[PDB]
Structure 1
């Protein structure tokens, strides 16, 4: 034999695969280098042929049950081919799922938001909405973008996401999994290894455990950002409350990087920018790439393949040549390692070169592994490798020895606090976001969160874990999570969380080998073979060994520890604590940007009706919103003589409860920002209170408009 016949199968598959795979990879590279209709079909055909080949061999893999397959190498490859996946789903079911996926993707990519003033100007997310969420510092404008995005595209995804969840669970259940969440937690799962085994459930526990240890640092970061944002947005942020979600520097608040302009610890202090030195010393893309190569060779990593230098888009096409330009490392196969990127003379590009080349080094290292075992130990290993490269290269030390930063300069601790905050805005700022999103998806997939509570728990978790509050209450007609790419494009997210931890663990371990004496935040692993050796040990492993073992190869551990992350931001932490001495470190999950003008409304049908007391449903609520809008119109047209077209949609309800109590506030007919002041709303109610009571066969007593009273 069984094991022998499984091996011969895998061997023949591996050989054929590689050559037939080279084509696919190369074909796509050629199209990535030249955008011609001919080049589209070129990779298209290759892709089909390649995928088809695999599919056939997948079926032939089943013929070798691992129960009898003992050699891990064969076992690993066999199980990596015996996966059926969506093939397990019925043709109709599969097609339906595929369609949902395409629709969701299309909506996300082609969904536009028209300006309320001019309907002719409609912004898509990629450029218009993103530039506003990244640059616009107008509370009203940001609120518009955020709210409008969820209201226009988020609703379009709600029904699709629901079906998606159902079909996804079925497929995974049929692929022998508790849910689609468990299906996704299979990446980190290790079995039949002595002490290196790891359960899919273990991941959850580990993530949550590690998260609790970061909470303190994030709370200080949050409190600091809150204080600064209070200055940028006065009369908008509570110093003890959560942060309005539309003010986090992006559409979702995934990163806080765009908040740096408003949170720079020492405005007077800049940050190292050796791009000028690069241009002054005529640093072309090839020059900067050689520096990358030099760095890796300095730590004892194999010299860049001559082939790499020969075939690699290391610079912008420059001519009419139409070539995509995203920094990308290519393992075309059969010893082919290329890099494609529109490189420029910039410090960023310099560091990006190191990052991309880091991936190439990993590829080259595991290139000698079985075709199927040529990848990062887990989904958070490969990216972390690239990250630690940029880390060491960014250090002023590195630049001063790279001949870009005159070493006569003295690194200022103020500029260090500056740098550390900026990093914390990207690194620590995404940790709660990532944690909460995956938690929500996991609970949703396993059914913990029912459909009627999807948005309910989403915002509860946001307010509690991330400390972020919705500027507008979002009911179960919304799908805020689906408004993010990964969610709408069926991508796991825990990778980001785990990678971050791994990265810091790696960096620390390697720097210990580099014999670092100063703050870890300023550590250069360059000119250290020992660090390279440890790195290489894991690098060459690939998927052959458990990720727990590969960890022990570098960090020496089997699980993700956040200690090194904390150690990296320890200087910043101490600093933040000082700044947050006067401030309240933490948030209250009760303050909302709309609570101020919100009117509480308790309804007593049975008190006024007893028998024949109709059940308050969504229709009764719809009627209520309509009644309030009517009142607002009357009040404005009478007291203000203003014909304002208030609709049930302007009546924003929240905290609906079985006592038939809820909170509502009124907004302008087409202005989410323009919230009608509670005073006016109270007067409007007073004016039409009788009418509203009549509509629900209630009375002031039963229809308790808290704050409004008869006289």
Structure 2
């Protein structure tokens, strides 16, 4: 009875029971998300509870198979994921306190209101609508400081205790702290030179930031000059951007600054929604077009049970539904897409995005249950986003008859498009890096409690080039005012998945022998590109993510140079546009100073 065979026998018993309990949990959850009734909440809770109860019990049996003694790395990975106790390593009382803490912060976030000089706005949609659309300095300031002084202040004492119990949980799971526990998602232990330590993620993420800083500084300088036009009495040409003028409640994306920053305001964006309606497209036509695109690159078509079981429109009966687009991998070769699709270019691109998740789910469906996931937390969205990249290009829209055969995209709308992309993609990278770096150092104890707000805004000025419009002491908890922080979600997933998606695109575009700028690339009708991609998709998480990445792009390394190549036409445009502007920022200046 060798160690490999005992644990494989255990995994065989686990897999045969997990597939049923996980399916019943997914099916009940599906029946709620597509039929919102009080009856189906309880079924979803009971089905979810018996699946959670089962996994907890199997996780404790699984810990008796020491990883060191297993020769089989495929077996070793399965036991590893199953052995990860998480919050179950805490005492039952301490896990219940943390659950109460996490449920109170989440409740405070979604019920928080801000009352002006009785009528109060929630975040959704009141305070949001102001932060994404208002061009008035003082109205955005009232919403920005109001959200952080009413909601964030409530979260300050709860988040302090949230850190204690999370670090205690991670220490019980034999990690440095909660931050080092999160970085374990990128830990590869495999063959020679595919190794990836949790501490190496810190150096990669920091190194990638230094390579990005020049492009970000030029986008930052261009946005600063354009904001100086609209807020002439509040903006400094060499200072950080006021945190409340960035296009949303936190400045995560700069997308909503496009009306203030569009390089050529008379050039409209290419919107093919009218062409879709003019041709009597409906939601079945949309997902049929998405299916043909994946078949064009050599990926399989949808199963018949996909078309029967999916919810591709908002139901025409009276049942209430969650309309947020999701791709469901329920198990047992049951793949579905839940989507309240409308006949628009936006939902046309979303259909390719969600079906990209489906292709990924179908590819690794023959893997053992515990290995059916992305290589790491950033692979699934990276794969889904490159499909909408190809489908959104005018070349592809012309080839499916949605753009006129005459159509020629001029340079101005090409620059308009790249600028719009950079507000979302490039603008969010320093924000994402600095946020998770602050959480990593708060969990590690490098940032003491009495300097949380001091360090948060010292790193905002330093890394993001963003300054607070109002001085905040330690009664505030400003990061907690973001959904992902208040709801206990790791954030570096948005950093890495952005790096991955442009490595994938550049690799697949070279395989398709595309010629021209990378942003005009359409991988349609290239079977070798989809075949190259599938060699990674079918791996699941059965191999080190570095090896899975190398099977597509040829490199074991998370590389940002592909993203820089994608935005090189814009960087060339920005350096000329910023010729009379200051590139960089000083961390000293404050709008309140």
What TM-score do the two structures reach when normalised by structure 1? 0.83
- 1:145-544 aligned within 5 A: 145-544=143-542
**Cα pair 2:167 2:177 within 8 Å, conserved:** yes
Compared with structure 1, are the counterparts of its residues 499 and 142 closer, same or farther at alpha carbon in structure 2 (3 Å cutoff)? same
Could you report, residue by residue, the CA deviation over 1:328-351 in whole angstroms, capped at 9, with x for unpaired residues?
A: 111111000000000001000000
What is the distance in 2 between the residues matched to 1:347 and 1:36? 32
Could you report, residue by residue, the CA deviation over 1:646-669 in whole angstroms, capped at 9, with x for unpaired residues?
A: xxxxxxxxxxxxxxxxxxxxxxxx
Q: Which SS does the other structure have where 2:571 is aligned?
A: helix
Deviation at 1:91, TM superposition (A): 2.1
Could you report, residue by residue, the CA deviation over 1:439-498 in whole angstroms, capped at 9, with x for unpaired residues?
A: 111111111111111100100100111000100000111000111111111110011000
| Equivalent residue, structure 2, for 1:61 | 62
- 1:75-94 aligned within 5 A: 75-94=76-95
What is the distance in 2 between the residues matched to 1:562 and 1:420? 17
What is the distance in 2 between the residues matched to 1:45 and 1:100? 23
What TM-score do the two structures reach when normalised by structure 2? 0.99
**Cα pair 1:277 1:404 within 8 Å, conserved:** yes
Could you report, residue by residue, the CA deviation over 1:562-593 in whole angstroms, capped at 9, with x for unpaired residues?
A: 10101000000000000100001111111111
What is the distance in 1 between the residues matched to 2:458 and 2:65? 48
**Cα pair 1:329 1:338 within 8 Å, conserved:** yes
| Equivalent residue, structure 1, for 2:28 | 27
Deviation at 1:192, TM superposition (A): 4.0
Q: Which SS does the other structure have where 1:246 is aligned?
A: coil
What is the distance in 1 between the residues matched to 2:398 and 2:241? 40
Could you report, residue by residue, the CA deviation over 1:399-452 in whole angstroms, capped at 9, with x for unpaired residues?
A: 001110002021011000000000000000000000100111111111111111
**Cα pair 2:34 2:321 within 8 Å, conserved:** yes
Q: Which SS does the other structure have where 1:331 is aligned?
A: strand
**Cα pair 1:35 1:323 within 8 Å, conserved:** yes
What is the distance in 2 between the residues matched to 1:288 and 1:407? 20
- 1:689-704 aligned within 5 A: none
What is the distance in 1 between the residues matched to 2:17 and 2:155? 41
What is the distance in 1 between the residues matched to 2:418 and 2:31? 40
Could you report, residue by residue, the CA deviation over 1:683-710 in whole angstroms, capped at 9, with x for unpaired residues?
A: xxxxxxxxxxxxxxxxxxxxxxxxxxxx
What is the distance in 2 between the residues matched to 1:481 and 1:34? 35
Match of 2:578 among 568, 577, 580: 580
What is the distance in 2 between the residues matched to 1:17 and 1:471? 52
| Runs of 4+ with >6 A deviation | none
1:142 aligns with 2:140: yes
What is the distance in 1 between the residues matched to 2:297 and 2:567? 25
Unaligned runs of 5+ in 2: none
Could you report, residue by residue, the CA deviation over 1:192-212 in whole angstroms, capped at 9, with x for unpaired residues?
A: 422111000000000000110
Deviation at 1:63, TM superposition (A): 2.2
Moved more, 397-406 or 61-70: 61-70
Could you report, residue by residue, the CA deviation over 1:57-84 in whole angstroms, capped at 9, with x for unpaired residues?
A: 1111122112221111211111111122
**Cα pair 2:353 2:387 within 8 Å, conserved:** yes
- 1:608-647 aligned within 5 A: none
| Equivalent residue, structure 1, for 2:49 | 48
What is the distance in 2 between the residues matched to 1:437 and 1:52? 34
Q: Which SS does the other structure have where 1:54 is aligned?
A: helix
| Equivalent residue, structure 2, for 1:18 | 19
Q: Which SS does the other structure have where 1:404 is aligned?
A: coil
Greater RCO, CA 8 A, separation 6+: 2
**Cα pair 1:3 1:64 within 8 Å, conserved:** no
| Equivalent residue, structure 1, for 2:561 | 563
What is the distance in 1 between the residues matched to 2:400 and 2:319? 33
What is the distance in 1 between the residues matched to 2:589 and 2:226? 18
Match of 1:132 among 130, 133, 136: 130
What is the distance in 2 between the residues matched to 1:20 and 1:45? 11
- 1:671-682 aligned within 5 A: none
| Equivalent residue, structure 2, for 1:108 | 109
What is the distance in 2 between the residues matched to 1:19 and 1:179? 35
| Equivalent residue, structure 2, for 1:8 | 9
Moved more, 460-469 or 93-102: 93-102
Report the aligned-residue RMSD.
0.8
What is the distance in 1 between the residues matched to 2:412 and 2:208? 29
What is the distance in 2 between the residues matched to 1:61 and 1:528? 44
What is the distance in 2 between the residues matched to 1:590 and 1:123? 33
Paired residues, number:
592
What is the distance in 2 between the residues matched to 1:217 and 1:3? 50
What is the distance in 2 between the residues matched to 1:113 and 1:570? 42
What is the distance in 1 between the residues matched to 2:543 and 2:434? 30
What is the distance in 1 between the residues matched to 2:301 and 2:89? 45
What is the distance in 2 between the residues matched to 1:330 and 1:358? 12
